A paper describes a structure:
HIV-1 reverse transcriptase (RT) (hereinafter referred to as RT) plays an essential role in the viral life cycle by reverse transcribing the single-stranded RNA genome to a double-stranded DNA copy. There are two main types of RT inhibitors: nucleoside RT inhibitors (NRTIs), which act as chain terminators and compete with incoming nucleotides in the polymerase active site, and non-nucleoside RT inhibitors (NNRTIs), which inhibit the activity of RT noncompetitively. NNRTIs are a group of structurally diverse compounds that bind to the non-nucleoside inhibitor-binding pocket (NNIBP) located ~10 Å from the polymerase active site. NNIBP is a hydrophobic pocket that emerges only when NNRTIs bind and induce conformational rearrangements of the residues defining the pocket.
Compound K-5a2 features a thiophene[3,2-d]pyrimidine central ring, and replaces the cyanophenyl right wing of ETR with a more extended piperidine-linked benzenesulfonamide group, while keeping the 4-cyano-2,6-dimethylphenyl structure in the left wing of ETR. In the structures of K103N RT in complex with 25a or K-5a2, the Lys to Asn substitution in RT shortens the aliphatic side chain and reduces the contact interface between residue 103 and the inhibitors, but 25a and K-5a2 are able to establish more contacts with Phe227 and Pro236 by varying their multiple torsion angles to counterbalance the loss. Interestingly, in the structure of K103N RT/K-5a2 complex, Tyr183 also undergoes a significant conformational change and is placed closer to the inhibitor, although it is still outside the contact radius of the cyano group in K-5a2. This stepwise movement of Tyr183 is likely triggered by three factors: (i) inhibitor repositioning because of the K103N mutation, (ii) loss of aromatic interactions due to the Y181C or Y181I mutation, and (iii) presence of a cyanovinyl group in the inhibitor left wing.
Numbering used by the authors:
A (entry chain A): -1 to 554
B (entry chain B): 4 to 213, 227 to 428
The structure:
Amino acid sequence: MVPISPIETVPVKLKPGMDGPKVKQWPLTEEKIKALVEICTEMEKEGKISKIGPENPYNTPVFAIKKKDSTKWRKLVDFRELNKRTQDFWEVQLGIPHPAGLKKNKSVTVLDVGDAYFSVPLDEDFRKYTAFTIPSINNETPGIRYQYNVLPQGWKGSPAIFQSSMTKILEPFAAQNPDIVIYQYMDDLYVGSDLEIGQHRTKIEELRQHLLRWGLTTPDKKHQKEPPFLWMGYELHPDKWTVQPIVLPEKDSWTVNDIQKLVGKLNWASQIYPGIKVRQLSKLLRGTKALTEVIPLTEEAELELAENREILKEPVHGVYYDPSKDLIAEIQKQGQGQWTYQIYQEPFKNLKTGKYARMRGAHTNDVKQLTEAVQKITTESIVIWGKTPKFKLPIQKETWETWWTEYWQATWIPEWEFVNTPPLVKLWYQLEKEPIVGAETFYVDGAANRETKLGKAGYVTNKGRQKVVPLTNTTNQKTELQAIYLALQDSGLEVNIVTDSQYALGIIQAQPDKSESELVNQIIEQLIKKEKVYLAWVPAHKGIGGNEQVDKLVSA
Amino acid sequence: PIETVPVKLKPGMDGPKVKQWPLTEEKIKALVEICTEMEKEGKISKIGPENPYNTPVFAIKKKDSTKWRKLVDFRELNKRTQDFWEVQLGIPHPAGLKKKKSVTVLDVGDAYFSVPLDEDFRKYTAFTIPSINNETPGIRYQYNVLPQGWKGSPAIFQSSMTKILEPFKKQNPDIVIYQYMDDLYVGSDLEIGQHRTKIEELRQHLLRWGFLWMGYELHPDKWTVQPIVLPEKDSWTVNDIQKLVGKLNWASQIYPGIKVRQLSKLLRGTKALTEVIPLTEEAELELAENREILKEPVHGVYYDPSKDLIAEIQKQGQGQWTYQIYQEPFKNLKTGKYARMRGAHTNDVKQLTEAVQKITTESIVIWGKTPKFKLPIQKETWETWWTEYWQATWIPEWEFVNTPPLVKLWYQ
Ligand SMILES: Cc1cc(C#N)cc(C)c1Oc1nc(NC2CCN(Cc3ccc(S(N)(=O)=O)cc3)CC2)nc2ccsc12
Ligand SMILES: [Mg+2]
């Protein structure tokens, strides 16, 4: 007998104040009972479960199930109730590596750790909670009662505890073999290296010798898979990676469910297929819960789809990461709040691609969206590669300098260079810091009746120009913007405008270049046409000339 | 210190479960090295999957230090940890500290590693060194001793500290020593030559009781509320008077008695913004009377220790930053302005981050606690970058201002 090391037990507890399950065993046919007795007798011989006396008061139901052609019964212990009552665990990370962060390992072996799993003992103090009962034939004897000694499949803690147990066992082998990589995925242990196949086979043998210290046998995975590996929705080849086939269906009729699957496919594709766009296809889902509601496609959603079909006609691939080369991220503006990017180390050889869509907002501008895209890519790059990329941005250095030195918020973007790839991001207007000499001065105001919703908007100027416009179905805030709009419409290329509207100032000081308000948009279009605009604010109802006059004109 | 002080969470609360944010490779490598040595010294231990808690960790560099340092973000654990009345009912915050001519800040967080943490509480200090690209599971640790940055540590360690210091205090009764989290604030009224000596005499005294060798030098000499000032001009344009009336209208929310009627009178009509208006005598008097009002302190300003301190910050341009600390609006307890932030002439976010730490330092000296910040920055930009410039061992709370305040002009 070769002594083997025990696998360290994880102490397990029920949630505070909760007891173990006490779920009644269902009745089963004579046929299923025979099947379950046979299965459990074999599990018992292998140490997986143990018979127990009648003192244990816990119970979880057991079932017997079949398959279409596989003509034998399967055991199923339903641990849902126990799972509700088991403590939380540090879970197996939901995150998986992104292929573009992987580095070349020419040699890979896949070991099956299915059998090692059953050497992981279940905390002895917890086993009582896993009791189950095989009902007896004709219910004329006591049911056969078992509990688990190993991690039950289907129980809440089994994946985290199995994974942690393997990691701890593998750790010394990994640290003393820095030229190999090891990655576990359920019963699959992937062991890779960039060594000549002979030296690699040796490391694999050394790994097997290591795991034997715990009595673990790990043979190669049945029916060794030829390249590429089909992993987590990717195709991993020795020197390149892509997503698995992206096939967009043809359809006369699209439902809310069909469009969801389409965006998901498109979103999956967008990590390597550059320029994918999903706005017009997502706009068809705004607010609806009926998933069979046939939503006709807009001519803009058809265009978008057709554009994505073109992008998807041919497979593209990414390359793996080379730590010795620089990491570069390039961004393009696509329109309607959409942005695309490529990350690469060599021109024309993308590590991966991606996209970024404008946040929901009343107002926005292109420089803010570009900044947000940069922050997203920055964070994604730190995740994948542990470093910020150098950026190539379609914004002139002088445009950026003007923006951040004058913008009221702090803002930053990391090391970057201009790439002259239209359309370029620009500032569409800039207000003056001081009043303009020789420019006419418009005092603007608007007001509305809260009940009738009737309003007025207008201005008076130092040249005696004046305008008041009656308005229907409006609000104070809206009349205040309308007044500014009228002053812009009716002035020369240089204009001083005086408002008392804190609402209007707050909007314009935010420097939007687009809005969900047509009126704000009309004001932006006027600003773009001016040469110089000074916008000044005064408190309302303080007797300030000009302002007092127009306030009267519009307040009835 | 063999005996551990029992510590619990607040009633009905579980431990923190805060996501670890992604870290650069150089920071990960630094944390691996630091934590390997800490594990060898017994300060932390690897934990298993039965521990589901987490607190974020990152790596910093103290002001002018090339050695990486581990910083655990215990903000969630601290709010979940029982309130402490450790050895008494509380240490009344020393009002004399802010009056000392010089205050030196000493990092004494290393002292915490000599006290063991309550064995039943350790699981709540769990933290993860993350992997790059999710390629390995994070390295999972918990603390065995009092951790730096945790609310419990100064509280549990306070008996040991007061004894370590008593001989020094007995000898220097005029030096104020105040502890906040991992820091000691040592103030006196001597010249830096004697003060440095004392400071070096204190760390030596600390080294003989079981350090760092670093120190920050503050001069809370003139920390006050900066007066509202009005322009003094020989010729006022329409625009100048409009700006003055707006500023006075704002000041009128703070100060009773502010009047603008006579100044508004000057703007009778619909005048060009650049037209020069002569001040009448009535308007000159009104402006002088406002000027006199603004020389007095604001009425009914008092600190209420049961309420949060609020700090607002404005970017003024050209490396200048203004800020106000208050508990209720228009009742400023302190106002200030910073310029030429060190080492960030081209980086807004670095400047803002340094202003946030300076203000927090001032807040600890004056009131013994940190303010909640209203930051003029988009959340995504701040969250991406602030850890890159952080140099303090505490971290305050903050929220984001997305609408430009009209008042930036008035603090201009
Ligand atoms: C080893 C492994 C396999 C799979 C799968 N499925 C997934 C992950 C996450 C794995 O884990 C790691 N993978 C790597 N690199 C990659 C680089 C690209 N290839 C694909 C390939 C190469 C050679 C052959 S071949 N010629 O032998 O047939 C076939 C397929 C696999 C290894 N790096 C790390 C670092 C830490 S974990 C980890
Ligand atoms: Mg009005």
